[PDB]
Design a protein around this ligand. Structure first.
Ligand SMILES: [Mg+2]
Ligand SMILES: [Mg+2]
Ligand SMILES: [Mg+2]
Ligand SMILES: [Mg+2]
Ligand SMILES: [Mg+2]
Ligand SMILES: [Mg+2]
Lengths: 45, 392, 117, 176, 73
RNA sequence: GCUACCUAAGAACAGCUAAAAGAGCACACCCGUCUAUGUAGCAAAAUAGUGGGAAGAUUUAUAGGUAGAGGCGACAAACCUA
RNA sequence: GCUAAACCUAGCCCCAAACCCCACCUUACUACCAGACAACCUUAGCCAAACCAUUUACCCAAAUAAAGUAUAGGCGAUA
């Protein structure tokens, strides 16, 4: 019954975790800054 | 109460920086940076000129500056105008007297069985069945498809009478023709910009139906008025317009004389379809507009009683219900409510068939109504054929 | 869920896949009805010379002598292109020598560069 | 014709094709602009033929005959491009004083880093461009801590590298 | 001493300036009074922004100077 | 991106009985009454049969919204990525 | 006798010194139309006080010393 909580959709993915949404708020900008500081290959989703 | 809430109204611009209020000093703005910064003054940008010039990025000038703008406001009737008072309003606007039923002159053209089409009912039934059931792979064709089809097939069926009537060779049904006619009514200038479709043009003008005595008898008839509804209601009040009378064709066009205007209300949705009264009003207005354009082209742009009245017919249909109109324009002196008046014979709500069953209704595994038209009325097609044959 | 693979036009739903391109430069615009109007001037016209009678070849003979690389400089170009005329007219308004005050008005403006390659 | 995409038919199947030398920058600097224009397409046709050979060799699972021809042609085209770029750069410096063909500016992005923002071409001015004004060319104060943290990460990497270099040098001295 | 203070009334303008005489400072300093650091940086950048002189002019001036020296010597 | 509720704009609902129905029987579909199996399983809640609803307060795809002392809740302290 | 077992530098730690082509904010890495929203605002709590309720050290701009002194403090933990 459970386990399939991920029902993928690229529209939702980009609108929820994308670069534009991350930059849309100061908190998300700090998210990107933390990922850059850590050296993440993928900064946003 | 004001319409449009503040939250939806355009936001007020932020207050100007106080630095702009100090006379002697030049504010330091981010204009030089070429991008916004929040700690510098907001520049005051001069309005940009080269913008609203490119064809794909064009802004039309204000209506006041347009070439045809006029302080006097015309009232235009176009194809998508729906008169509130309907036939009464159209009669007042066109200075017309209504006569119930088609005239005997045209009705007699189909009394003799020679004009009756061989296998007339069979062919008309096939036309109705093709339009309403057999037209497409879809089970139930929509009105947008079966109204033009029914009209065109009926016109072809009538045109088949070229055998008996060689005069039918001097006519042609043009499509997308557009006419424009302007005239005054009690200091109100009214225009009709008829677009519609299926103008049946003939090489010869239609014979007049009403005699001089009847035309003069129209003087006594009083033009019915409606209050407090102004006759202007539901007409597009426009200040941009052209007072030229356009018949829709360049000079020298063969088949110059309008014969029949085929107006069809083919909208799938009832609210997008004209009411029968409003359709009859539109027929009156378009027939009057075409007749008036013809009169202004022939006898000049002078308000006068026409020595030779101009006759224009019209058939307005929704695919099932038809309305037949013969309009005799016998005066271009429209401004006054007194004098000889134009006159229109109208036959209303002539239904070609009562209903059409695209699917066989089955109750308790028993077929009650078979597929096909029910209540077919050949009389309406007789009237249609009479209108087509008039003048031939 | 694939954060590492490159975002291309093969990935999203129909709107995404239609909207994203592959870097090809635009050739025109879209009008009503999604009809594409192609602008001729937007299409790169290849200026291909006539190679008939050309003597140069893709390769150079190894018998050619070695030389020292001397990258062209503004000073060298000025000396070899303007200095002779300047001297000849000084011994005897810089537009006469080739200088243009502004690039505006030229087809091939040097800055901001407005031509391909 | 399409035959220009392939070598001379006599060379088909030859294990080796004799080729000259790549054009050098100095050799090209002596040629006219028209001569460079024509040589560019000569080299382009040769490059297309060689790329066709390389792809067909991969398809047939055979070594490409004289693969150094492609390297020579690429070097020649790079030299020609560099020569033309040198001439254009000199002309631009003479007539405008600009060391760069494309306009740009040093700007601080939303992440506080200094970048060379290369300008783009627009039909409307920047203060009217809606998409441009969404882009932020300033860093708010919450970026300062991350700027310091990035600087210190760089400093740690540099210190590690320098210490490692010195230790390697000491090890070499002890060995010899 | 801007004449835009009450133009057409020089006596009143001079009276005002005399009243506030003690605060007068050089204009080169008054231009920078009360500017934030970012505003001052932008002001300095605008002051020192100059479209580069074409190297044509520099080389022409240098060549003319050299030719003058050669002619004199 | 589950789920709860909502917003926008969609879609589905055989056949029979009945006749404009939060109607009846019963497919698709939704659910989960009872039994059995399974119990590191096919499955971190499934399977088989049985059963309830099945033109509606229905089911459902898409996009959006409400965020933690908060949300949402036909209140089970239920649900808000096992 | 299998599985294994062993190895030494890859680098790292602490100091010192020294101040360190093109694309991409729209669905980022997307050649090319009407902007305007543009930032600023005491940390709290864990914890100690054997509960807890006032209270309970925290990049300071010369180390040492004055001195854990003067002071503060449910005058107590402590500061
Ligand atoms: Mg779902
Ligand atoms: Mg049913
Ligand atoms: Mg029911
Ligand atoms: Mg519920
Ligand atoms: Mg309860
Ligand atoms: Mg305690």
């Amino acid at each position: 019954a459970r386990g399939n909580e991920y029902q993928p959709s690229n529209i939702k993915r980009k609108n929820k975790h994308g670069w534009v949404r991350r930059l849309s708020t100061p908190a998300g900008v700090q998210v990107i800054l933390r990922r850059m500081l850590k050296g993440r290959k993928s900064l946003s989703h | 109460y004001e319409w449009g809430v503040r939250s939806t109204r355009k936001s007020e611009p932020p207050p100007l920086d106080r630095v702009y209020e100090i006379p002697g000093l030049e504010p330091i703005t981010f204009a030089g940076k070429m991008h916004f910064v929040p700690w510098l003054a907001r520049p005051i940008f001069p309005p940009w000129d080269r913008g609203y010039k490119d064809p794909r990025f064009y802004r039309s000038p204000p209506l006041h500056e347009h070439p045809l703008y006029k302080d006097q406001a015309c009232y235009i009737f176009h194809h998508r105008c729906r008169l509130l008072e309907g036939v009464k309003q159209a009669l007042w606007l066109t200075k017309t007297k209504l006569i119930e039923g088609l005239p005997e002159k045209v009705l007699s053209l189909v009394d003799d069985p020679r004009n009756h089409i061989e296998n007339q009912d069979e062919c008309v039934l096939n036309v109705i069945s093709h339009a309403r059931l057999w037209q497409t792979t879809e089970e139930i064709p929509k009105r947008e498809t079966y109204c033009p089809v029914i009209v065109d097939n009926l016109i072809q069926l009538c045109k088949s009478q070229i055998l008996k009537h060689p005069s039918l060779a001097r006519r042609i049904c043009v499509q997308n023709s557009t006419f424009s006619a302007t005239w005054n009514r009690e200091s109100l200038l009214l225009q009709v910009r008829g677009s519609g479709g299926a103008r049946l043009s003939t090489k010869d003008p239609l014979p007049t139906i009403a005699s001089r005595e009847e035309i003069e008898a129209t003087k006594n008839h009083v033009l019915e008025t409606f209050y407090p509804i102004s006759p202007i209601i539901d007409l597009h009040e426009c200040n941009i317009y052209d007072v030229k009378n356009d018949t829709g064709f360049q000079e020298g066009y063969p088949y110059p004389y309008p014969h029949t205007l085929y107006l069809l209300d083919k909208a799938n949705l009832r609210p997008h379809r004209l009411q029968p009264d409003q359709l009859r009003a539109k027929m009156i207005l378009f027939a009057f507009g075409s007749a008036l354009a013809q009169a202004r082209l022939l006898y000049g742009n002078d308000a006068k009683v026409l020595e030779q009245p101009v006759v224009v017919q019209s058939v307005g249909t929704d695919g099932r219900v038809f309305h037949f109109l013969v309009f005799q324009l016998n005066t271009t002196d429209l401004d006054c409510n007194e004098g000889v008046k134009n006159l229109a014979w109208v036959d209303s709500d002539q239904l070609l068939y009562q209903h059409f069953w695209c699917l066989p209704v089955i109750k308790k595994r028993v077929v009650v109504e078979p597929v096909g038209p029910v209540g077919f009325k050949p009389e309406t097609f007789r009237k249609f054929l009479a209108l087509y044959l008039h003048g031939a | 869920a694939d954060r590492m693979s490159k975002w291309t036009s093969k990935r999203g739903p129909r709107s995404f896949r239609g909207r994203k391109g592959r870097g090809a430069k635009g050739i025109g615009f879209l009008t009503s009805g999604w009809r594409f109007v192609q602008i001729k001037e937007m299409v790169p016209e290849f200026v291909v010379p006539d190679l008939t009678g050309f003597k140069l070849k893709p390769y150079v003979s190894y018998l050619a002598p070695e030389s020292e690389e001397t990258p062209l400089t503004a000073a060298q170009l000025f000396s070899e292109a303007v200095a002779p005329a300047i001297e000849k007219d000084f011994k005897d308004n810089l537009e006469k020598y080739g200088f243009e005050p502004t690039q505006e008005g030229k087809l091939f403006q040097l800055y901001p560069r407005n031509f391909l390659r | 014709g399409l035959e220009e995409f392939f070598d001379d038919p006599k060379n088909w199947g030859q294990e080796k094709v004799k080729s000259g030398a790549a054009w050098t920058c100095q050799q090209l600097r002596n040629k006219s602009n028209e001569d460079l224009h024509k040589l560019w397409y000569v080299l382009l046709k040769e490059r297309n033929m060689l790329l066709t050979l390389e792809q067909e060799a991969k398809r047939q699972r055979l070594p490409m005959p004289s693969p150094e021809r492609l390297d020579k042609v690429v070097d020649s085209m790079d030299a020609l491009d560099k020569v033309v770029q040198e001439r254009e750069d000199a002309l631009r410096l003479l007539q405008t004083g600009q060391e760069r063909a494309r306009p740009g500016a040093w700007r601080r992005d939303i992440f506080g880093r200094i970048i060379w923002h290369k300008f783009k071409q627009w039909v409307i001015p920047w203060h009217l461009n809606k998409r441009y004004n969404r882009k932020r060319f300033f860093a708010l104060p919450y970026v300062d801590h991350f700027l310091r943290l990035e600087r210190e990460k760089r400093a740690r990497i540099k210190a590690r590298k320098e210490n490692l270099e010195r230790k390697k040098a000491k090890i070499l001295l002890k060995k010899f | 001493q801007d004449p835009q203070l009450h133009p057409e009334d020089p006596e009143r303008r001079a009276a005002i300036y005399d009243k506030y005489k003690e605060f007068a400072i050089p204009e080169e300093e008054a231009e920078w009074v009360g500017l934030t650091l970012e505003e001052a940086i932008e002001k300095q950048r605008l002051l020192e922004e100059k479209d580069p002189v074409p190297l044509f002019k520099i080389y022409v001036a240098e060549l003319i100077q050299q030719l003058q020296q050669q002619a004199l010597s």
